[PDB]
Amino acid sequence: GLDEEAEQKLFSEKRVELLKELSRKPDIYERLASALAPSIYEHEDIKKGILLQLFGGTRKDFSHTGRGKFRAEINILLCGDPGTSKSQLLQYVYNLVPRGQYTSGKGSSAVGLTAYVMKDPETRQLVLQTGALVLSDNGICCIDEFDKMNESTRSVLHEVMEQQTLSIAKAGIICQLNARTSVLAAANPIESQWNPKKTTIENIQLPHTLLSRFDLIFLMLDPQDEAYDRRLAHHLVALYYQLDMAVLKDYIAYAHSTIMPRLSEEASQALIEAYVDMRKIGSSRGMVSAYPRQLESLIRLAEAHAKVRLSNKVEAIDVEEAKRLHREALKQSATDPRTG
DNA sequence: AAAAAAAAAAAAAAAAAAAAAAAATTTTTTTTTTTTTTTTTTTTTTT
Fold this sequence. Notes:
Blueprint: H1 2-6, H2 13-24, H3 28-35, H4 44-55, E1 76-80, H5 86-96, E2 100-104, H6 110-114, E3 115-120, E4 125-130, H7 132-135, E5 140-144, H8 151-154, H9 156-163, E6 165-169, E7 174-178, E8 182-187, H10 200-204, H11 208-211, E9 217-220, H12 226-238, H13 245-258, E10 262-263, H14 265-282, H15 292-309, E11 313-314, H16 316-328
Parallel strand pairs: 1-8, 1-9, 2-5, 5-8, 10-11
Antiparallel strand pairs: 3-4, 6-7
This protein binds one DNA strand through loops.
Subcellular location: Nucleus; Chromosome
Family: Belongs to the MCM family.
Protein name: DNA replication licensing factor MCM4
């Protein structure tokens, strides 16, 4: 938790040295991605993205710049056919992370997510009760069935995902609650099935205003592949008859405790070129167009990868990995700049 | 047929009109009984 991470004496020197060795290990990224959800079969990219979400970028103090508050959290949207294990991944993250909240489909409401007023039935006094987005203030909110979220409540997510703030101005109480959450959402393509004729956006059916907030979108699509089907069946049957959580937890805690990656000059130039190329690619008709929110997303992902590496300095390796992850997500490589 | 807007309802919170509940010893009077005094009646003593 946040308090345990803040406390100085959370790790012995031996544990610190062991974690630093694990970091100097060259495949620590893939090791941790595989460790996450150990019983989810080869979702390497999705697991890597979720790991980056857990690690999170750097907290930045832009108060002196009069710019506002920058969201260091990473948001992920798993757009996939029902039965693609997106709900399983959502539940795994929900049960794994402290300060985790879970909502699904039409079971939520704008007031119930933001806040409301009730009558505390022990003091007989009217008090204010938070919602899921506030209870997950410094953690994660998992929104399953993210498409059955009638806009009345989906509108609330704009403020949360943009400025980490929830400005409530009701009859009696005016305030702005901190909602510095990370959103992991699950969406089903229209008709509950991905038409292999409509483009990515036409299938997702989410407004660009919202989709540009998610700094990672994974298309859980099913390739009709013999090897994949056979190995998946083997794994699923193996579950029917038969890294450590400790090291993973300690690694994440140490990373949050004393890792604050900072952009280097080379990484800055790489990010500039990455954003220009990404915008050029996304200019296509039906693809997910890239706005400067995507440069922000690339910075976030690069910082998260640097934190995973414990570098403390964001590097061209990290920015390139952010490029690769954001590109493999949405299947940009596998989609032509005209059709899906 | 699906999404958004409108409204319609349900339930909960709040503020008066009427009804219902709570809180409450002390002073003065009179009656009885008992005693004291007056006069009449009766008794006793002296011539």
